[model samples]
Target: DGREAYMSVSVAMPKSGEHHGTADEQNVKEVLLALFDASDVCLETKTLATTDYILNVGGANKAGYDGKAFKVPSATAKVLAVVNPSDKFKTACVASASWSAINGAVEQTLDEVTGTSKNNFMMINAGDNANPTNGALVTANVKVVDGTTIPDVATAISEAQADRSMIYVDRVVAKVSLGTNPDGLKVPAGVTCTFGDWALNITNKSMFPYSEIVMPAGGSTGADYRIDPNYELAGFDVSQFNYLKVADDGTLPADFSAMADSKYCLENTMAADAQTQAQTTSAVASAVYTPGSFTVGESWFRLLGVTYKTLADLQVVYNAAKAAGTADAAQTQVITLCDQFYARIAKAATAQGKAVGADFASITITELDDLKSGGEYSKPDAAAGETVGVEYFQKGVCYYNILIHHDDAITATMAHGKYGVVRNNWYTLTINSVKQPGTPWLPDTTNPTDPKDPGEDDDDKEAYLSVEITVNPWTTWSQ
Candidate 1:
């Protein structure tokens, strides 16, 4: 042991805001500290006792727990902290031989994120700086107190001294919430939309509690949180994530309702691959898409937006046919118009040298129900070729996929780690507008092979909805 030096560790008080977090989130139950040397060797590890460390519950103790300085051999060391750690995590810190072993530890449960307990949430050191590589493993310089007997337990310490030995920590989980003004959700005006319970879907169940920096060739790091490096669009293994709300046997959990009402998720991120797009990201909803009570046969249709540029051209034919008497004649004209529409599509397909055939070879009132399930060809006109501009409202739920962002500007092409949730970050998404409905259970162009119990795929994959997201640092542990 070289020169005599001491350092104090303290947890920062959480700041409040609408999306900041609840009182439970700020409660610090336990802390596990690790000290590493220059060569990334573990020199020491300490788990602070309840009475040994103090967390500011309120301004009651204005000069509350500043921090407890631990006596160490070196003047400078790599310091890391974990708050409310699991038993396994504690063992990793205390028993592990090297920094690699500790850093490589994985968080296997979702109890901290999904449960209601305040202190159950675990957090790890995110370092003093936000740099991806050295962020989690913070380097600290010792600052000595005035007297020799080592500073006694006090109310508080100076900010200057705290800066030198402070080890900042952040939660391993990210919080997501919806903005107020549910009225912002725009749909067909007459549609009675009931915003049901929501939850985070397609979430990461297991993750490295400590952030893992995925650096590309040029060092242009778009995202620092690569939660699931193996996550791919083709072979998305759902077992890797914690799917809440429903059990594997299709039975709802006892806390299903309670869980759906709260939105919290582990880091479900993707690298620059086919699976890392916006739709693949977990969407935030209270739960269920229960809008307007409709029976089985009436909930879907191939919308006009996909085929016809506008309702004007189709309406013109409908109006002309209706003006001429009988329902039979009107149906005939509408069918003829649909045939013409397919002919045009065939012409376009032939021009592009793609396979050409009429999916909508014929249209009749008798097969109105058949239209809803006919992949791409048959159009289910709720009006049954009777009215123009017949609005087919999606009586289902819609959600804004939380495309977690690390860097704001670089998302057009280089999606290396662009979309995902990072620990200690709060993602608040506001639905700017919901022009149309979204997918029933999850959003995907084609049926996603990922989810094990994806309720039902929305026939209309092009359901429109616009959302705005803001990222915040959830107030890291300061002292």
Candidate 2:
């Protein structure tokens, strides 16, 4: 009969090897249940609160996150559970006419992405490869019993003989751990390397609640670099607060000897060719309002119209002046050196047929980047009799960029599923070694240079660090 019937459904978080809970206070905050008919059309949606669950007692194999009887149509065949979802996510579920609509919906601002609370981590159905589009929502077969015999739904469901279904869920955001002792690596002797701060760069800004990892076809696996139409990169709004943990002053870490052990970010998958794009790798320095000390010093050189031949000269003059006298004396000598530096570059630009500005004060920092790219700033001279370059005196922050990997499948022709991040995975990056300090400015910032090479003439020099990554069911990657 096509009549309304009652069904008991229990939601469960991913077991820690055959374990489940009642309140699950740590991994669950909000819950939304969607009932779908046999045709996969959503029939109803219900939001559950903490009070709605029957608290599990201290016993092995106890019922986990059980709920009371919910009225559903006889045609209802499945129940999907979404845990710790945002209000918008819940709305998207409720408004969805079919299960496919829910999967296609994109969340622009998911609190779960940047949130640290395991209690509030977002989780969706833990579907398998069999159901590529839909996760394994609990299938329902209504066991109609007399309403008079309906005892307390919780108590009845707790009984092994009672009719109930389980909806297993997995977290939507992947966890990244640099390990508890992340700064275990030591730099080579004589190299001043401090394990400064580390953060997730080039993360995704938007994600589908029901995400999918679309792998490449059979016998071909160069790792699919295509950005899912539903996903959005963190590139559009550069300054947005993301997985980059900041201090109370809202400033990102800019010093050394301090590092964040872990962070969580939305999945970021891109087109293969765009994988190395500057914006994709420059998430850090681009967001900085105050350029790093080294970058600021380089800009000062440009603002004074100095060429590479004399750029280090400023640092030498400043160092000698500081050693000889006070800060004021150094400042005084700097002005004198600035005047000389300006004339040298201006005179050279005139001869080279390059346009030279009359007054350097009018040029902005952005324009300086353009001029430098145009080869207006020549390469530093190693044979110019200057012993120490500006870099020797400059102490600034640096971060190693990580291109998150999803699969281990490597072939001679292609490394399939190697560089994109997916949901319900834990990526552990273990620092193996630090050779030198990272670039003072983020390697990818405002430059058309490879982050790895960073071009010889580029001011943002690339520094290096090494790591080993491993993955598990949180799909853990240990590096």
- Model 1, which residues run further than 4 Å from truth? 2-5, 13-19, 50-63, 73-76, 105-107, 112-116, 128-130, 142-164, 179-183, 213-236, 244-262, 274-279, 284-414, 439-463, 476-479
Per-candidate TM vs. native? Answer: 0.62, 0.61
lDDT of each: 0.50, 0.47
Candidate 2: how many backbone clashes?
15
Give residue 203's lDDT in candidate 1 (0 to 100): 66
Query: After superposition, which runs of candidate 2 have C-alpha atoms over 4 Å from their true positions?
Result: 16-25, 49-68, 110-118, 130-136, 144-161, 179-186, 215-227, 230-260, 270-274, 277-396, 409-414, 445-463, 475-479
Give the 10-residue window scoring lowest on summed lDDT in candidate 1.
372-381
Using TM-score, give the best candidate's number: 1
Q: At residue 177, what lDDT does model 1 achieve?
A: 66
- Model 1: per-residue Cα lDDT over 24-72, one tens digit each: 6766666777777777777788777653344543212224454545565
Each prediction's total of clashing residue pairs, residues at least 3 apart in sequence or on different chains, is: 8, 15
Tens digit of per-residue lDDT, candidate 2, span 190-218: 33344444556645566667656455443
For candidate 1, give the lDDT: 0.50
